[PDB]
Amino acid sequence: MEPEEGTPLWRLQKLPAELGPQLLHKIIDGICGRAYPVYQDYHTVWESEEWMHVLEDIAKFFKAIVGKNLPDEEIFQQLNQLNSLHQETIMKCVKSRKDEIKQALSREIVAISSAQLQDFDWQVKLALSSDKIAALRMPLLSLHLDVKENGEVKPYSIEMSREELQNLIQSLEAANKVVLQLK
Template sequence: MVDSLSRLPAADCLKLCHRVVDDICGREPPCRKDYGATWSLEEWLDLLNSLTGFFRLAVGNNSSDEEVLAGLSGMSSSSHAETVLSVLRGRREEICRALQDRTNSISSATLQDFDWQLKVVLQLK
């Protein structure tokens, strides 16, 4: 589905990719009304899910540039693939922090409960 990104000019592709990363990082997501003439609602949602998943997977797996480009090999435009890669390179640390923060917010309560249960077991011995 990332191939439909080729419908945009390269400059707009860059802007959209940065807005998708902004959304991953908890800031303002891309606005559909800016791209309503380019994609239907279903295509728009598929594109956002694909791009978000791609950025998360690339950062989570610590993918090299070659692996990222291989993942984008289905795109008809190599300039758009390079644009996605440039956004990933420039904002990798930011995406990584956002993913770590999201993981920590989900798991911190569980870890606190685990510590409490461990103390009870140790006190019973």
């Protein structure tokens, strides 16, 4: 004996259908960058080695139907095998979360590159003296970059005077002019 196979949501047929909306929205939160659901809530529904495939099979479905901009009728036709409440649940999740999923995909298209800026921070400080000169009073900016490369996040730091920061901003303003012709 073995379960059915077909639309990869065949593993959802094991759920009690009243749990449907909770799990599917929480998987979408994980797609978009929040926490995924925890197995402890569903350990009676799937095996621990099976649960890992439930998450993957659901995430692929939502990504695929949004990326292809499918019509609602073509989505219904893919859901024909599911329980009617699971069919209705999934259609509602699409309508409510379509625009949020689409933004997650756009973020993932930027990752088709060798390195990405993950986060930044900055500090302004005043240097009051040094071993070279006692009446130094030089403003400096420290810019901290977190760059994701080869699946690891690397910290960089860059220090700028008033004039270096002016050249930086003047260059990024030229880039922004081009961005705003496209955006």
